[PDB]
């Protein structure tokens, strides 16, 4: 937070919501422009190439207000004391759930023991809902997925869902917003799969600021974002994103617990 031409000037950053920084900034700059306008501030906006990159940018002091992912926030909080102000709503909900999905014909009476030795497909390690959360779940009950299952990492959620539906793999990670989107789009037949495990609620994101960011501004940013009507918030953001709720660190407990058990919060 600095002064330029006699005015507050803010550095904003948006996670990679869309396949390119250009497309992300096109669709999400409006909520940031709105925020800066409501403060009478000028601004800069960047969109790093990865969810990890925006966490690093915030940690390394390059960002006044960041749209971080939940794990990016928790890590940045641990490393630099980054504070969360709010969480974005998608179709009115500020949270999602990580899933493990299975072929509909899998005989699973006891989870996960009945699935021992089956194929499991998790995502690339940088994906919170596809890897961090389910891997932390297995570790939390004494399971090493690489030894317990016929295990693969690196699949996309679309690969997992299509391969499950076609009977080629057994279990795969997904997240509920994504699975629903694929059903709505007619891209998968949900009768051929079932949810065998769901996480607790995970916050969609974290609107974040540095440690010791001016308390007056924190409050004002929170008020400006949480005051938005569904229609006004949606007019300023990509499809589905339609409000903000006030947030606090404890909302991220499931995320923090997962990073904790995988040794990702050790100094």
Residue numbers in the entry: 2 to 268
What does the primary publication say about this deposited structure?
P. stutzeri WM88 has PtxABC, HtxBCDE and PhnCDE ABC-transporters for the acquisition of phosphite, hypophosphite and organophosphonates, respectively. These transport systems rely on a high-affinity periplasmic binding protein (PBP) to impart ligand specificity. HtxB is a typical type-II PBP, with a binding pocket positioned in a deep groove between two domains separated by a hinge region. A comparison of the HtxB and PtxB structures showed that sequence differences within the binding pocket essentially eliminate an oxygen binding site in HtxB, providing specificity for a ligand with two oxygen atoms (hypophosphite), over one with three (phosphite).
To probe the role of the D206 in ligand binding we generated D206A and D206N mutants of HtxB. Superposition of the ligand binding domain (residues 95–204) from D206N HtxB with WT HtxB shows that N206 points away from the ligand binding site in the mutant protein, rotated ca. 180° away from its position in the closed WT complex, and therefore, not in a position where it can interact with R178. We note that residue 206 sits on one of the two hinge regions of the protein (F96-K98 and P204-N206), suggesting it may have some flexibility. In the D206N HtxB structure, the sidechain oxygen of N206 sits within hydrogen bonding distance of the V89 amide (2.9 Å), altering the mainchain bond angles and rotating the N206 carbonyl by 50° away from its position in the WT/D206A HtxB structures. This change in mainchain conformation results in a 180° flip in the N205 carbonyl, requiring N205 to adopt a different rotamer in the D206N structure and leading to a new hydrogen bond formed with R178. It seems likely that this rearrangement of the mainchain very close to the hinge region, together with the concomitant change in the hydrogen bond network across the domain interface might result in the D206N HtxB mutant being unable to form a closed conformation in complex with phosphorus ligands, explaining why no ligand binding could be detected for this mutant in our solution studies. Comparisons of the D206N structure, which crystallised in a partially open conformation, with open and closed complexes from closely related proteins suggests that D206 and R178 are positioned on flexible regions of the protein that are brought into close proximity during domain closure.
